[PDB]
Copies of this chain bind each other. A is one copy, B any other.
Amino acid sequence: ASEKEEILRKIKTQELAEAFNKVDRSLFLPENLKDYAYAHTHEALPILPGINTTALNLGIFMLDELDLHKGQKVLEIGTGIGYYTALIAEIVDKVVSVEINEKMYNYASKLLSYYNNIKLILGDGTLGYEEEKPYDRVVVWATAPTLLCKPYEQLKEGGIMILPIGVGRVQKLYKVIKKGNSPSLENLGEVMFGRIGGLYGFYDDYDDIEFRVNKLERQIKSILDN
């Protein structure tokens, strides 16, 4: 708990403040990363090849902006290691959380036993989760090509959704308040999340000149097979 007090001081939602103080984040982190429970708070931690855990400073900010309170039903796209799932479960009535990667799904299955209000789904988060349909809030922990349609449809009328939108290696964090097909979108800043996979995920690779050149270099390397 080094940068723990810094982060706690900033929390605007009293309920989140308490959940944050109580849940021991080292309990959801592997052995190798134990020292990052409350230190290096601005970095994303490696869990699986190609998959990280959002930076604590970012995560707490997002949840704080989610306006979480008693008796809400929250949909979370991207269970991961279950830590942010736990913090929501502490505040909210029920939590439906989706994970697309099986190994990740397995790793967390055991870590959330202490909770009886978290439904863990193994599937395409891009579809959200129809079946417990009306949600009060939705948090996505990976960037999308556009506004995720299913989650948005599943949101309650005045619901609030937070997700990173953007193709390209640097995206934008958006706070969406449902209002028919005229939501209000508030850019909360620049962020760098990994790409969400699935039906409404990405259909082509990163399109920045660095990537394009890396590819050219890959192909010429292989064409020189001729």
Q: Which residues of B contact A204 (CB under 8 A)?
A: 165-168, 171-172
| Tally of this chain's copies | 6
A19 on the interface (CB 8 Å rule)? no
CB distance B147 to A203 under 8 Å?
yes
Given A107-B31, A210-B208, A216-B216, verify A203-B170 contact (CB < 8 Å): no
Closest to A218 in B: B190
A216, B218: Cβ atoms closer than 8 Å: no
**Does A113 reach chain B (CB closer than 8 Å)?**
no
A142-157 near B? 1/0 per residue, CB < 8 Å: 0011110110000000
* A201-220 near B? 1/0 per residue, CB < 8 Å: 11110111111111011111
In the complex, chain B residues whose CB is within 8 Å of the CB of A219: 220, 224
Contact B147 A200 (CB under 8 A): yes
Q: Are B202 and A146 in contact (CB under 8 A)?
A: yes
A47 within 8 A of B: yes
Q: Is A158 an interface position by the 8 A CB rule? A: no
Contact bitstring A111-146, B, C-beta under 8 A = 1, else 0: 000000000000010010000000000000000111
Given contacts A46-B52, A147-B199, A147-B200, 5 further A-B pairs with CB under 8 A are A32-B81, A46-B48, A145-B146, A168-B207, A212-B217
A-B contact pairs, 12 of them (CB 8 A): A30-B31, A31-B107, A32-B107, A124-B181, A127-B181, A146-B199, A149-B149, A166-B204, A181-B199, A209-B209, A212-B213, A213-B216
